[PDB]
Amino acid sequence: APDSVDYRKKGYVTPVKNQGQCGSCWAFSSVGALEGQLKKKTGKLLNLSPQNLVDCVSENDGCGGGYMTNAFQYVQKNRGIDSEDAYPYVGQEESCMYNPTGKAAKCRGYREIPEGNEKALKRAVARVGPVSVAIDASLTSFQFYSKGVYYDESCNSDNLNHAVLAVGYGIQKGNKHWIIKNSWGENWGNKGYILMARNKNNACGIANLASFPKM
């Protein structure tokens, strides 16, 4: 795999979104990974519907939380996911309003990265595109990130509580990193992004629950 890659530069990544008060990070993570695959497959990028996911993925708990893999499976079995335009984000769990004729993407399943394996995560990012990941995002030091490569030893890689999207990886002043898209809006972190430590013993659990959709 290459030393560095940044899918934002290849047009695979939509603007940073803001999930608001709803615990729908899983839906944003999911749609980000689906948006990458859409671009790679069709050459066109479009915002996909996180609300579609929050409302219709019955095996998840809406604004209470969810798994990305459940969302991919939903899209696969549903034969589609709506665009954000067709099914806008409202930030509370409502009745399912999916319309097949507003579908903007499909999914033929999903693959999971071997647990803890940052080298396999690197290879997935390099070869696939953006990958959904879960992390411990509970620390004040994460919440108030502004610059640099984030590393805090008190992060608990076994305490996953947030889902985000790995859109690349690189190195900054010998500190290898992952390029992470959050869903806390553009006024969070560095215009909505955080550089997280790569190859520092799976810092924050970055490679513990990674997956991507197949299209």
Ligand SMILES: *C(=N)CNC(=O)C1(NC(=O)c2ccc(Cl)cc2N)CCCCC1
């Ligand atoms: C995002 N704002 C909150 N975090 C999550 O949703 C994560 N999943 C869960 O908390 C979770 C998963 C599955 C069910 Cl059915 C219910 C819940 N609450 C945090 C763990 C990592 C993946 C996302």
Ligand SMILES: [Cl-]
């Ligand atoms: Cl419903």
Ligand SMILES: [K+]
């Ligand atoms: K990390």
